[PDB]
Amino acid sequence: MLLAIDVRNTHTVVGLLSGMKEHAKVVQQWRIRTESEVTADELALTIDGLIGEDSERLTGTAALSTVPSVLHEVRIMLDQYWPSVPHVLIEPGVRTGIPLLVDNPKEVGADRIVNCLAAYDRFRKAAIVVDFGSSICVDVVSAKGEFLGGAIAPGVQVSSDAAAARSAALRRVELARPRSVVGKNTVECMQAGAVFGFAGLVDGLVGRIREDVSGFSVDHDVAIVATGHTAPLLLPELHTVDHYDQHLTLQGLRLVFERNL
Amino acid sequence: MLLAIDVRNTHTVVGLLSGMKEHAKVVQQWRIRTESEVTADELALTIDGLIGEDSERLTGTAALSTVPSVLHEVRIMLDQYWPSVPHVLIEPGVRTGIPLLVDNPKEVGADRIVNCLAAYDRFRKAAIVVDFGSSICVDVVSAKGEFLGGAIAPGVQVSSDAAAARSAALRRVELARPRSVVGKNTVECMQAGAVFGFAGLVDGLVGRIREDVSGFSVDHDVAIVATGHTAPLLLPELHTVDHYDQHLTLQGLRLVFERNL
Amino acid sequence: MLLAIDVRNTHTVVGLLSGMKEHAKVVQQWRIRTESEVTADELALTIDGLIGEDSERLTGTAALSTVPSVLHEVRIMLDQYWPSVPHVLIEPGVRTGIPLLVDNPKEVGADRIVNCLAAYDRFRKAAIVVDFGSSICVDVVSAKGEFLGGAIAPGVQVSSDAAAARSAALRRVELARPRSVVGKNTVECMQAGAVFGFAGLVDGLVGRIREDVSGFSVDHDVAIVATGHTAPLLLPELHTVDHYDQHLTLQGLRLVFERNL
């Protein structure tokens, strides 16, 4: 199998992907915390405990990170614990076959590049990727598979927790859909805010991108794809998102791994 | 005049309002930070420094606080520094004439009550109040002047600061409208997110309220009013908000003061 | 066995209970840190490591959480990792057989409900429960098995840590009984405060409850029970507490599981 690692600011996705090229599928996926101060030995311990008996069956290990210290610890862990398998660590501004038509090609985070590559591979047309992570990352891929940029909004959970911490009457609540958009208690009001407001945020960003750029209007065909952990919660309230792909970034990591191999 | 105090989670607004009833208006306003550990003497010192020689011309004072410790200190300060003028303090579940048709009438913040009272006094019909503070508070006022609840979304500035602080690759940026919806650098992407996405958040909340609850549809005349310090940044991008009042909470405090006088 | 999970604000108790009804006892117990950001996969990994070979010998699971995010993750973990066994999850306002004679039955924490249920099951009369956790929760159970309310005092370790952090002269000390109430250095004075003053706090709360409400006086038969990890520290210095039950919340979780089975 192929061991894929997605390090974000708050949560790390560890995946096992069997197969190769078109027939390859994600057979396993786990979500863990991201610790900035994590070491190679701790990360090896948790990853070994997650993947169990598949450690001896690894054929390669792809990895990206938005925290560079975790990326360097990933390199140390890979060389110390899995020396016989190849590994292609990904930095910001990686080369993949997707032209980075932006001001600073070396500053865009690796997750956005991987999402763009996977979306253009799956759809082969113009695409808008909405990634619900620690931040909501919106990526615009043209019909030629070129990364035009996009937007970076605060994430649902991070913003909700920040609002709960920044206020006294607002406490920490569970991220769930309330009975109505008009709440009757503080928990219901906060859940209505966090869910419906961020659904409106994503819909507004997608509609504004569709209207205010050429080739992405309603007349054209553009694949709107959402990924992330909290995407299924907000998906029924989105009128602008067509598809949900839970394994988009892992498939993109597999694409970069097979391209660099 | 009347000394109105608005203690929010992040900033405190001090206003001098002259006149009575309909002929009353905000003649002076200052904004300062809210200190959780501020005392009666410190707050009286800064308020005196702000308002100058108008202390002898005060006819009354009125305060609300979403922070309980500052509410205790404001109670002490009102009882200590201006004993000759009447004062009204506003605790959650206060006497206003607006029925609190919620599960816990004693848990709803005083700012929401005061905003609902001011909006219904100004419009005399069904209203949707959008306050842009530390959190974005959406309050729904029925056609008979009843507080039906609403939503509490994360605020623009708090969420953007939390996004910047959680990520090592994201620095502190100023909230300003970017060039296009598809940014080209990290700062442009973050600004596009924070501005357009939160405008979409407010639009989605107001549209969902208009569609779902009865008496607030397109056919019914509903007054959509926005207030707050960071409201003018998002107001040009809002499609659902009809009015902007920057002195709504001060006018509501004046209404409570004159009602309880 | 039954797997019981007590998620508190600071620590999490994981227990294995064998038997049913009266013949049921706690056969295993572990204490771990409560991580507010922990995930279902990480919690499943640590619980599997704790319980070892007992994973395949589970007949049911019961869980409570005072932290909403850990409650969400425990919900996911229960529906993901042990699908072949029943699971009861306890939210506030849970049907247990104990009436909640309070203003907001949906806001009393799950730990207090579970403690009241276990106490009234054990003693079958009026009871006062003192849980020593992050806070000291005092719960008042009437003679008919009704939760009348109680008090939430600051805890001992949390308050001592806050006092140490707020002052430059006070460092992180280890909680222990001093030689005397009148200490001679900073460590002795701080430990005398933390131990004897909080013992007096518990004694004063229990005595004032015994004096100020009907049915709990010295004439009535009232069971005073203490639970918690730091309870044995203050137990020799308490005059009002008659019983110490360490596994009270686990037994209450078992009671809820059997009631809802």
Added chain:
Amino acid sequence: MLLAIDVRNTHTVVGLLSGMKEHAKVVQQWRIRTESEVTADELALTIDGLIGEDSERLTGTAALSTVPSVLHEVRIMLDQYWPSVPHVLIEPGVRTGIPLLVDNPKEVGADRIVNCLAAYDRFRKAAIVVDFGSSICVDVVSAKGEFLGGAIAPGVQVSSDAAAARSAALRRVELARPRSVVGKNTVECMQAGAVFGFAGLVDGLVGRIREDVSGFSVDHDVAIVATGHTAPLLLPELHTVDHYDQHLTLQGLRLVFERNL
């Protein structure tokens, strides 16, 4: 006038005292919050704003601090802004005429020594001093005016704030007296816990001191004096405390100033 400065870990008391020796009394007092990294210019600005036109009428300044940085900034401010007045700074271990019969006489903070000196000057016998500040300091003074020692418990407001911050279900509450010891909501439960529990804490500490040290029995006449900002709130719920003196530390500062003059 004499300018007394009390720098505690959380608040600073600034007092103006008129008269000398027995005919002296506190005529002005203000409470401000303590900033650990405050500068001499900021502190001079706020102190000047507090004391008004009495800057030219000062005849000396007495200052103590539990935060040494603020003490050194106080010395800089005094030498820069009031050069014509004599100023006595007070460190731990200050010579006062009260012997320090403890293990480390140079570690007991200045506030405790000043309180002991003022109490023994007022009562001229054995005394127990309960000082409600950032922490609750209990001081025991024999019939010969010696500092035998005491206890240092967490303060009421600091502990309540820490309990609110540590727990997700608990918010910040206004420190006031509830209706009863058995609370019906979370706010009432927290207020009952903090108030009645800390009253029991003080009662337990004072009673244990009276019972466990020589000559402080109920038969012997021992004066119990309470000082502090939150002392009047807990005073009706105390049984072992007789006298309340708000200006005890300012009078002790006056005594030290007159001693070093």
Added chain:
Amino acid sequence: MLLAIDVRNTHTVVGLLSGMKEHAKVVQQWRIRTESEVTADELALTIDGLIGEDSERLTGTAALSTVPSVLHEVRIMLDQYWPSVPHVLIEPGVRTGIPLLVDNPKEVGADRIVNCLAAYDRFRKAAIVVDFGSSICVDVVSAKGEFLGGAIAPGVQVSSDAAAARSAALRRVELARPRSVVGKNTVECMQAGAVFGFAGLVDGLVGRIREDVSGFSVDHDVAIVATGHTAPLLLPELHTVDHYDQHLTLQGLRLVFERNL
């Protein structure tokens, strides 16, 4: 006079300078805390209280800031409260007559540019500027007055506070010279580290710059100048620093003000 403002990360220097060109010296200076979220009204209040009756006698204001939000609020405060005075606010990358020979001329903070300008104005030759601020900034100015770059080390007091916060055994100690380099207790060891190790840090940076870049060898005449609030503390322990100019940044601000007028 000229009102100069230095907004650093931790402290803000407010200076009044009289005269022009060679006849110009700093006549007033104050240091205050930098509140990153301060408003224009609070800043106007404190600056007015600092400058007293010199508000009407201002002829122009010069300001820089390493915190952009404070600079924006400074612009608002200046245009609201001092509308009749000219103001040249300074952003990073200011053109001053010192060529910026670095990779990103728009990213170097305005403080370093101002220090380089004032040092080259004073010495008219090659210079090394050591600024002890929140960080330690070493700037290298060539013989032709060109900013060649430098180094940014952690500050002295900031790193000492970080060490105290990261360790329980290390409390908040005061920054002062110890008896010797070999400390006989924890406080003396910490002060020996903070003083002598940071003096060695400055000496090592200065020596390595003198040895490893062209035109700055010991044979050439290079002026080594130090500035900052904690510079006098480490000044006697440095073997590589010849001059200490306390008002270097204020003089550079005056230079930029007179150049842009």
Added chain:
Amino acid sequence: MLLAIDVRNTHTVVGLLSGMKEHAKVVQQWRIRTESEVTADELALTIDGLIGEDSERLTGTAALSTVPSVLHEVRIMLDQYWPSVPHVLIEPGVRTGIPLLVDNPKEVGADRIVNCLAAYDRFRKAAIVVDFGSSICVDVVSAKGEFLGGAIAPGVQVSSDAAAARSAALRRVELARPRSVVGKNTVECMQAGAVFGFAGLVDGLVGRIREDVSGFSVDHDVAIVATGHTAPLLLPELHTVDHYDQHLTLQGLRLVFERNL
């Protein structure tokens, strides 16, 4: 196999040592984070996972901890989980055959004593030990194997992270050697500071110690040993440090274990 545990304030080192007396060398080593609130069960879980199949081959466990809570949890963990092996815990001020000639011999941390013992055992003469950890510790050992004292400077990585977090314009950067001492951007300047300045800090402390104390001059022979995780980074840039030993504290724990048996 001896099991060594080094609990520093930021990272914990775990070691497996085989052999006795001179024939003893470290065979295994891991580095993990240090958690303050960690429990015995969690720590036993991670230690067992780290050490794998060698848990049944242990013959003793020497452990030190600069965090006493983790030390007591280690004692609980060792007694609960490895009851058949001896365990020599180490507190501050331990006796090792090295006299502690300081003002408070019981306040110096255990890591310093262990490093001094190991260094004198290796070199059998006067030595200067530089331990790069959460704080840089410098230890001075005379020719008689006595702990004279030393310095505690802020660490490299800890101070770099503190500078990145405190300053708004500075992000979290990776700790690595830059190309030139005169950095041409912000990141290069920060890395030049963090590397060359801290190398100069160590060099200055060692040189000042060598000059100002008896028997440590250039004519005398004094072994200079370095240890720590980040030590090899600064080792090329050091001039006064002669030897490196990454396993100094583990061998010192081995020496204390062999001494206490």
